[PDB]
Subunit: 348 residues, 3 copies
């Protein structure tokens, strides 16, 4: 009485084929989660959602095989909008998600716990749908994120973390709009203080051998995003453009002083199950101290998903990695090899 | 047919505000668990319960984010009582729980895996309700706990653990009684052997710099508890008094040779959702070698919970920490700062 | 509509009694899992299964307390057979499982992540039931396993692991057949390349103090298995014989150049719940370099299970360990002490 509660998840039998040893092999994993709603009164509704990743590709004595992707509780007051708090998606992703639809790859001009660009600890999000019911299809969002800092130091918080996934106080906003038939447009902005260890950490160069500062200096990390989306007539066309400031990771050795990020995807849905997909993603870093302008990410993606029904599917995906081995990709530990994925997935 | 089985849990979007860096920030977490019953025959019933904590306030590459709070299987033979085994609550908590009702704080003159004072590995518990159906409201309990020891040494067990959470063989008993209207009284006693590493470990002083024995010497660890509870007329009044012997932790540097523990709470339930709450907790350690008598814990707590319904609530809680920085709180790593909590929680 | 989905698991309140400190004490744990089916069309069916182990015998600050036992997605095309991929049982276990029916012990002439002998990462399995519906009771299986390698080195994969649980490319096949009344016969074969760290790792001798190669040299690891099973008239008789080549572990210091493995079990099911059980298991290693022929495993097992119903049971099991302390069992860290188990288990 009153409460709805759904168990959901999937089991993904997955194998990667690649020349990069740290990528190649068995990638089997599963997801399980919970979605809940309670109607409090005719205007007010409470909700909660949890989503868990459980790796299955290592042993029963291996370590760190599970993690939480989402955990948030929330309130939705009809026409006034909604508010939720917890681990949830940064609002930049309200736009960039429109290109995150590849069978297995994609969605990686950005990472998780990467300021407000994806999933994020301690994020307070306000959302409004049809501009208070006055403008159908015109959604916007306002978000706040507290500092998630180091385990020690001046910038310690209880939930410490290495410098690549720390953040200071920040906010972000997003707007999406539906234009006539299926065509949607979106903008998103975010801004965060950085942390001492982000500005004061060093790293040791796989090429020279010497020690240097972690790429990126700055008091602030920033993203600007614009996106377009065609969805109708069994066509899916989408693109997104994002420009960032000390916000985009350069492998594991820091951030890019400036980076320009671009993703474009085209897909077609046959009504006998098959869903082919073509995509291009790049990330171009600027003024990265001793590395100057370099590609951070650059590939073409080709793949397809076969849907047996809403509970079962198979997919192949082929990442054609147009990066070259150099001192930047080596010193930053960015993979320059191709990958093939092959998946058979049960959903529930 | 025959079996009942309930999924239960909650998602708790929670943030702490504090000057103590190791406490402050995002504290989002979730609980999920299972409660089960099977009727074997008209007298005999089997049951099982599991309860899991999943942290959500750190990253997807962080470690140790989940843990089990309860896991026990059991048998209940009508009027003869019940028996269960596994990870479950030490019976001291049958009384001290009556003060563990604060919105977020409280319940911490004692810890988990802290002999029979709270949740505990390998605990065999016998419970009897209305004294075999002869005295309505008069419950008692008998409990046994095997040694949970070190990872190495003379006192090794399979499930080793640091000295602050080891225990030797022990037992405990508890009695509660309902007096007329809502007024309940309770007593509880426990006794355990200690372990070699508890008596033979050293620690390094954050103030002097030198090495010393871990506070507390003794073959035995002991607790005596008395408690009172008023529940009726939308009032909740409760208090509990506990005296311990090498059983109460002194931060992370050992145990208190003697400690006197006191908790008192008053709450009021308005029938429009709001539930204000006032509380006082102290822990006073005695004869702690080079530290003598010191406060181990001392605060006032002020907070409130708003229940939208049985599935949704919001709460604020304010811990006013009356401890002062000194060599004891510093050398033992006890927090002396205030904390505010702010939570929005979905239950299912 | 279309999808079946079952939550399943058990809570096992369990205690071990033993002179081996690393074995003795509380062993409480739980299992939880998911089994799913979707009918795609009248011939074709998709399925998925996940099964999770959650330890409960250590603290809430302990590490590595959970792990995945099974995670696989699959397809079943009526008379043509089935195919599944993920973490699943190596097909050798299609036969050796017939002796894995002891109340608590047994099933340990082999381990998990032990080539195709038990549960295994990245295993692709084809199964066929009544030989395409032509021969009732005659099942066979074909299986493939990709390399699961080191975290570094020439044999790195993404899901690295210590040498005792690495494997190279391998395959395995199995056949079972039902003979008239309850009597079944089975054969199974497997073959895998080994890995550099399996052939190139050293270890330090608990008896001498000096360094030596990890037992077992060889390009290939191999198993041959035959098994018999009587099931009917409330009798359970089963035996299995397996001969292995650099495939059977010698504690933690390597593999046995050759090992001959034997298990035999007899049980009786009274229809008032009780199920007594008697068993013998040995593992005899050959030509193990400086250790020559030694017993790797040798015990008698005596125990019983009481079933209150399909959801509740109690069991005792007594492992009489006929191994002697020597340089082999010490240098390999194999336990030579007896064990008693005592369990009360709730299933759902």
């Amino acid at each position: 009485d009153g409460n709805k509660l759904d168990l959901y998840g999937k089991i993904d039998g997955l194998h990667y084929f690649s020349s990069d040893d740290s990528v190649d092999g068995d990638q089997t994993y599963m997801r399980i989660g919970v979605k809940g709603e309670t109607q409090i009164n005719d205007q007010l509704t409470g909700y909660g959602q949890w989503e868990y990743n459980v790796q299955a590709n290592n042993t029963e004595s291996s370590s760190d095989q599970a993690w939480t992707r989402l955990a948030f509780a929330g309130l939705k007051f009809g026409d006034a909008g909604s508010f939720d708090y917890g681990r949830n998606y940064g609002v930049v992703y309200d736009v960039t998600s429109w290109t995150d639809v590849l069978p297995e790859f994609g969605g990686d001009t950005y990472g998780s716990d990467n300021f407000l660009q994806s999933r994020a600890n301690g994020v307070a999000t306000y959302r409004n749908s049809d501009f208070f019911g006055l403008v159908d299809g015109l959604n916007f969002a306002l978000q706040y994120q507290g500092k998630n800092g180091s385990v020690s130091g001046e910038d310690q918080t209880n939930n410490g973390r290495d410098f690549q996934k720390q953040n200071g106080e920040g906010f972000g906003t997003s707007v999406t709009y539906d234009i006539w038939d299926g065509i949607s447009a979106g903008f998103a902005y975010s801004s965060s203080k950085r942390t001492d260890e982000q500005n004061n950490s060093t790293f040791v160069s796989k090429t020279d051998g010497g020690r240097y500062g972690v790429l990126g200096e700055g008091d602030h990390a920033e993203t600007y995003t614009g996106g377009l989306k065609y969805d109708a007539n069994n066509i899916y066309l989408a693109t997104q453009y994002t420009q960032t400031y000390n916000a985009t990771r350069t492998g594991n050795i820091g951030f890019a002083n400036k980076a320009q990020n671009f993703e474009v995807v085209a897909q077609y849905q046959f009504d006998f199950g098959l869903r082919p997909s073509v995509a291009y993603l790049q990330s171009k870093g600027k003024d990265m101290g001793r590395y100057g302008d370099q590609d951070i990410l650059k590939y073409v993606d080709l793949g397809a998903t076969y849907y047996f029904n809403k509970n079962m599917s198979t997919y192949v995906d082929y990442k054609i990695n147009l990066l070259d081995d150099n001192k930047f990709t080596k010193d930053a530990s960015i993979s320059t090899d191709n990958v093939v994925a092959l998946g058979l997935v049960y959903q529930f």
